Amino acid sequence: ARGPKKHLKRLAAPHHWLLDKLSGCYAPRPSAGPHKLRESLPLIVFLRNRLKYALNGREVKAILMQRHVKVDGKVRTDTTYPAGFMDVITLDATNENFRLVYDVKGRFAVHRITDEEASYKLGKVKKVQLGKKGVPYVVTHDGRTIRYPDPNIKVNDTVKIDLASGKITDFIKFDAGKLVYVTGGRNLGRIGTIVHKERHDGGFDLVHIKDSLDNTFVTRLNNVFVIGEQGKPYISLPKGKGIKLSIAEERDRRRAQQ
Amino acid sequence: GKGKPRGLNSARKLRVHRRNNRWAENNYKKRLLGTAFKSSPFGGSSHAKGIVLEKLGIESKQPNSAIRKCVRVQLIKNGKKVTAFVPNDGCLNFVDENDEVLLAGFIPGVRFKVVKVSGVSLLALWKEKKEKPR
Amino acid sequence: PRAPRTYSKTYSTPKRPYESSRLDAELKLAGEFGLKNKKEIYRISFQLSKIRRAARDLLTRDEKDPKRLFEGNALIRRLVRVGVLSEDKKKLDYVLALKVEDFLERRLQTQVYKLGLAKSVHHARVLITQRHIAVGKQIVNIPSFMVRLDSEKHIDFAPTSPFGGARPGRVARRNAARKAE
Amino acid sequence: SALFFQYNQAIKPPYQVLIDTNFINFSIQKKVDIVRGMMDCLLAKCNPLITDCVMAELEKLGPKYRIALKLARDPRIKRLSCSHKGTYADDCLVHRVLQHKCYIVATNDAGLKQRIRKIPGIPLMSVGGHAYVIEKLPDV
RNA sequence: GGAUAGUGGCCUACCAUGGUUUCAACGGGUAACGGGGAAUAAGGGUUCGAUUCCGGAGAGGGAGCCUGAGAAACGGCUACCACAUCCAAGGAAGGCAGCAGGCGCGCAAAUUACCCAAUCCUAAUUCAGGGAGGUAGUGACAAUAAAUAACGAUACAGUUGUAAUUGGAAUGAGUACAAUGUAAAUACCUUAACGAGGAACAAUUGGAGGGCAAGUCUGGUGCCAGCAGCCGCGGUCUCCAAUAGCGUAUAUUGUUGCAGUUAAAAAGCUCGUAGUUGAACUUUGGGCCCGGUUAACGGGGCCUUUCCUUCUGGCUAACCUUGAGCUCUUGGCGAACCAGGACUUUUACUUUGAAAAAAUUAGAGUGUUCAAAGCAGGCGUAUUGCUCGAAUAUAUUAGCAUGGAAUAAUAGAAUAGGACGU
RNA sequence: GUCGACGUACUUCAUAGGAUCA
Ligand SMILES: [Mg+2]
Ligand SMILES: [Mg+2]
Ligand SMILES: [Mg+2]
Ligand SMILES: [Mg+2]
Ligand SMILES: [Mg+2]
Ligand SMILES: [Mg+2]
Ligand SMILES: [Mg+2]
Ligand SMILES: [Mg+2]
Ligand SMILES: [Mg+2]
Ligand SMILES: [Mg+2]
Ligand SMILES: [Mg+2]
Ligand SMILES: [Mg+2]
Ligand SMILES: [Mg+2]
Ligand SMILES: [Mg+2]
Ligand SMILES: [Mg+2]
Ligand SMILES: [Mg+2]
Ligand SMILES: [Mg+2]
Ligand SMILES: [Zn+2]
């Protein structure tokens, strides 16, 4: 190619979107934004294929141009805006608030939250550095640059950000025993507690996580997201609380409830 | 020892020995060198066009004889003359001198049978479903 | 371009179609069940071969294997649901004991014949293809329709059919009008 | 009554199969298990059966064929009694199939195969190439 | 040093003479874009992959550029090579390997169709544009389902067979008010009214076998045999296979695991480099404790001459002790464990975990009327509504982390230039 | 030139043996 691409084939789209393979030939390409293309849920998919409020892309555009949708407290009018992990989506007309958190299966879930919980979000500190004029700042996983951070905040920590002011209200250090959420790999969507961080210089650090059922799994440090102390997450968790269940157990539960 | 290397680090000798020896097969040699169609009756084609020179058995007394169904045809591709069968003398009426005939593989020595004449199937003509265009 | 839509062949030619015993078996099957052609028998044989190969492969797995347990239970549940396998024979060994006749008996043609709605398998086929048979509230015109155990008790004449309480067909009212005139 | 023209409508799974003396040799030679090889070939449970004539025939073979004798005595292989004096297994095997039409004959002798072939409705199993083959069995 | 966004012989100046190769360089062939994938196969293997996704390259062939964040762009420009259109002969304009449609033969094959309604893309932008894309049309590409009759009576013939016999019931192929469908239409699903006895509302493709004459031809141990018989004096038949499909032609090596006396193939003999292969030996056994499975099986700890070393830091067990009732508490001592710095033989092999896009393959659930499929859907309903899914496995080699320490290599103390130290 | 050698593609000749019966 001679420049950036602008089209996305349906078969090439992220699997977790759960798009019909025969509905069309193209899928919404997420516009540039806070979250990476493959880790993001464009607003069209959320409003149409998840909430079912809109029956087609044109109706999604009609909804957005009415300014009814806010992402992290700010109105967005782009159909393919890349909403992503820990993003608060507010619909005032419906009096509804959502937080985009993976379910255990590895797909963004329709998780409703309260207004108080919609006032803040969490962000993994991806970088900490001095800017111009010697003003320290932290860069989080959604591209937010926050100046004058608490000096104790280091990389891999999780900062609680207030959406109204975009200021750090609280922070959580990365340490053993902390409650974490897996945001990548085949263990995506699971919740557990750190046991041990294996450090390899010049390579990828691995973290061993123990879930509530005592199962243990190893994941790269890039996919880990601290969300609180054990049993006391800073956010309301989805149904199932991030616990993986074997196919037989899922069958048993499904038959029991049916 | 069976006359072959068996050491665990002898893969190269086994590969190279095999590659040299596959050329002994005639099937392999023909397949790679693209000479498998020299033996084919039509030189690689499934059908051949020809020009009807003469009907050799037109005069034979016994009706529907094997000789009566033979026609001497000239292959257009190379000009070699060959003999071809006709399904029956009734079909032999349709075939006449100087028509293009499509031949297919089949009195020993006759290895071809006519399937089309003047671009029309003989079986279509024999069943009275088409007319020969001239 | 749009993504491909999958397709598959529901039958296969047998290894030796020309075995005399095989020819006689196909003749008996077609006559007993009123099958149109050997394609239907090949189709049922292909399904049965697939099922039995799956069962054999599961049996090769060690007992208590999670894959064996899950897949074998699902397969046995399906076979019991369609009616081929009896309730008391819920094991993979009895899945290998199935035969083409078991599947053929479940066809809507044979069931319509057996329930007394038709006087022969051919009469049942004609009744089905002419839209006289309803499984529940749904008219079914496919003789190969495989009846489930629950569906077995709901086969009846369709509400729209002349035999099911609707008005007489075209011939009946035609003749009635000609008699009246 | 069990035969419809040349089609046997009585032989149904699980099958009862008579093991011939030479069948065991080629089963061993080709490294094919008796119980599973029949399961793979027919996709059904098979009940191998060894008669007294074949069993006596095996014992006469000698020390060389000890493995075949050990396999023949595996507990899964049921035994069939004989009420006849002669010990020739081929004659015994031909006799039983004539009486009752439910048995598969597993053998590799050309001569015995021809005699069974003349009898109608007798599936005839053999071991060739890499696994077992069944000839006259429509349900396959 | 120059140049580039930047590393770099990328180029320049000066220097050295280096770099690859029998573990196959270099050169040649390729009817060579690579992969996900497809077929076959019991397994190893063999072959196919222009072709729905990803990546690369090209826009007739070389070369060079403007603009711009991004192009060595070609539905942008300039030159040359080959073609080729208009011309008043002075000049001007070209690139379908985009969608339709032509030529390339004298022998052949989709429509120069409708639309942005869905999918998404572009813009100043909800609105315009989109031959991208969808819709319909068009050679049986590849696939799913499935009509062409069912129930009786009579008749005739050797309880069987045959009906241009006969009775009144059923229905869609088709036609068509209508409605639904659709951007508008066609079609599907529905449905008034028509639509069946030769049900002429006229199923096909191959194969086998007969029999008939004042007939024709050929041969001869008479009247016969072979070939065969649409043709004679006048006159203008049965069965078999598949089935909305069927026929014809071409094509379609042993690692596991081959053979070498007498019927393929052991070199005349020896030496010998690469390559492959290469004797045995170094912690074995014994005594206890802990917790798991179904008395067996496996997993951990100690002890046995068997603990990595060192420093620093964090916490602090146990041990000594005071006091208050095995538990708290005073004051010392601080093992174990954790974190970091130094210290360090290297691999082969195998176990476990991440990674190996989606689609595809296998596979769970689901009455698309069944099915191929699709990822849907399901339950109540006077009213407002509730709710389950979109699982799971596979994937070689290389790279990464990890437990083993059998097997096979590798290094060490010999002129001690060796180890250790309060 | 019905030329030699080679390469390629084909054609062809070598199949009956034992037992019983007349
Ligand atoms: Mg790094
Ligand atoms: Mg030896
Ligand atoms: Mg109707
Ligand atoms: Mg220079
Ligand atoms: Mg290729
Ligand atoms: Mg090429
Ligand atoms: Mg390709
Ligand atoms: Mg280009
Ligand atoms: Mg061109
Ligand atoms: Mg260019
Ligand atoms: Mg163009
Ligand atoms: Mg272009
Ligand atoms: Mg074109
Ligand atoms: Mg403006
Ligand atoms: Mg050497
Ligand atoms: Mg050794
Ligand atoms: Mg690996
Ligand atoms: Zn016996």
Among chain C residues, CA nearest to A19:
C3
Among candidates A29, A41, A24, which has minimal Cα distance to A101?
A41
So where are chain A's domains? 1-116, 121-171, 174-244
Residue pair B71/B52 in contact by the 8 Å Cβ criterion: yes
Task: For residue B10, report the phi and psi dihedrals to the nearest 5 degrees.
Answer: -105, 30
- In this complex, the chains that touch C, judged by 3 or more CB pairs closer than 8 A, are A, D
> Could you give the CA distance from residue C122 to residue A50 in angstroms, rounded to a whole number?
50
Residue D13 in contact with residue D44, Cβ under 8 Å? Answer: yes
Rounded Cα distance, D8 and C22, in Å: 10
Which protein residues have their CB within 5 A of the ion that is ligand 18?
Answer: D 51, 53, 82, 92
Distance A206 CA to E333 C1' (A): 39
Asked whether A190 and A240 are in contact (CB, 8 A), the reply is no
Architecture field, domain A121-171: Beta Barrel (2.40)
Domain ranges of chain B: 1-134
Take residue D79 and report the two structure tokens written for it.
């035994």
CA distance C101 to C32: 10
Subunits with at least 3 CB pairs below 8 A relative to chain A?
A: C
A4 C-alpha to center of ligand 12: Å? 15
D5 contact residues in C (CB cutoff 8 A): 20, 24
| Residue corresponding to tokens 């989805």 | A238
Element (H, E) at D35: helix D34-42
**Residue-wise DSSP of D60-113:** TT-GGGHHHHHHHT-TTSEEE----S---HHHHHHHHHHH-TTEEEE---HHHH
Kindly state the helix (H) or strand (E) to which residue B84 belongs, with its residue range: strand B81-85
CA distance C46 to C58: 18
Contact present, C106 and C83 (Cβ < 8 Å): yes
Fold (topology level) of A1-116: 3.10.290
Find all residues with CB under 8 Å of B49, minimum gap 6, and list them: B75, B76, B77, B100, B101, B102, B103
Subunit contact A22:C5, Cβ cutoff 8 A: yes
Domain-by-domain residue ranges, chain C?
17-181
Helices and strands in chain A: count of H runs, count of E runs: 3, 18
Provide the sign of the torsion angle of the four alpha carbons C48, C53, C58, C60, taken in this order.
positive
Whose tokens are 């053999």? That residue is: D126
Enter the resolution in angstroms: 3.2
Q: How far is the CA of A27 from the C1' of E94 (A)?
A: 39
DSSP for B2-32, please give it. -SS---TT-HHHHHHHHHHHHTT-HHHHHHH
CA torsion angle for A132, A135, A138, A139 (degrees, to 10)? Answer: -20
Q: Would you say A171 and A158 are in contact if contact means Cβ atoms under 8 Å apart?
A: yes
Residues in chain D closer than 8 A to C26 (CB atoms): 138
* Contact between C30 and C125 (Cβ < 8 Å): no
Judged by CB atoms closer than 8 Å, whether chains meet at C1 and A25 is answered as: yes
Q: Is the CB of B40 under 7 A from strand F?
A: no
Q: How far apart are the first and last CA of chain D?
A: 22
- Give the span between the Cα atoms of C159 and C139, in whole angstroms: 9
Of the options 3.40.50.2300, 1.20.120.790, 2.40.50.1020, 2.30.30.30, the CATH number for the domain spanning A174-244: 2.30.30.30
For residue D107, the number of C-alpha atoms closer than 13 Å in the C-beta half-sphere is: 25
**DSSP states along B49-83:** EEEEEE-GGGG-SSTT-TGGGEEEEEETTT--EEE
CB contact under 8 A, C96 and D9: no
Q: Beta carbon of B30 within 7 Å of strand F?
A: yes
- How many C-beta atoms lie closer than 10 Å to residue D136's C-beta? 23
Chain C closest CA to A209's CA: distance in Å? 24
Contacts of C67 (CB under 8 A, 6+ apart): C58, C61
Burial B67-84 (b: 16+ CB within 10 A, else e): ebbbbbbebeeeeeebeb
User: Is there a contact between C143 and C109 (Cβ–Cβ < 8 Å)?
Assistant: yes
Which among A22, A247, A248 is the nearest to C2, CB-wise? A22
Chains that touch D (3 or more CB pairs under 8 A): C
Q: Which residues of C touch D (CB under 8 A)?
A: 15, 19-22, 24-26, 28, 49, 52-53, 56, 93, 96-100
The one-letter amino acid code at A140 reads: T
Segment A231-237 long-range contacts (CB within 8 Å, at least 24 positions apart): A231/A179, A232/A179, A233/A179, A233/A191, A234/A122, A234/A158, A234/A160, A234/A170, A234/A172, A235/A86, A235/A99, A235/A101, A235/A113, A235/A117, A235/A122, A236/A99, A236/A111, A236/A113, A236/A114, A236/A117, A237/A101, A237/A191
- Of the candidates A70, B99, D39, which has an alpha carbon nearest to the alpha carbon of residue C55? D39
Separation CA B68–CA B90 (nearest Å) = 10
**What are the residues facing D7 on neighbouring strands?**
D4
Distance CA D38, CA D47 (A): 9
Look up residue D78 and give its amino acid: K
Q: CA of C25, closest CA in chain D: separation in Å? A: 6
Distance CA A243, CA B1 (A): 59
How large is the greatest C-alpha to C-alpha distance in chain A, in angstroms?
64
Q: Return the structure tokens found at D68.
A: 């075949």
Phi, psi torsion values for A158, nearest 5 degrees: -115, 125
One-letter amino acid of A155: V
Residues A92 and A252: their CA atoms lie apart, in Å, by: 39
C96 and D121 within 8 Å at the Cβ level: the answer is no
Q: How far apart are the first and last CA of chain A?
A: 52
Q: How many CB atoms lie within 10 A of CB C26?
A: 22
DSSP-derived secondary structure for A130-186: E-GGG-EEEEETT--EEES--TT--TT-EEEEETTTTEEEEEE---TTEEEEE-SST
How many residue pairs bridge chain A and chain C with CB atoms within 8 Å of each other?
17
In angstroms, the CA A70 to CA A92 distance is 9
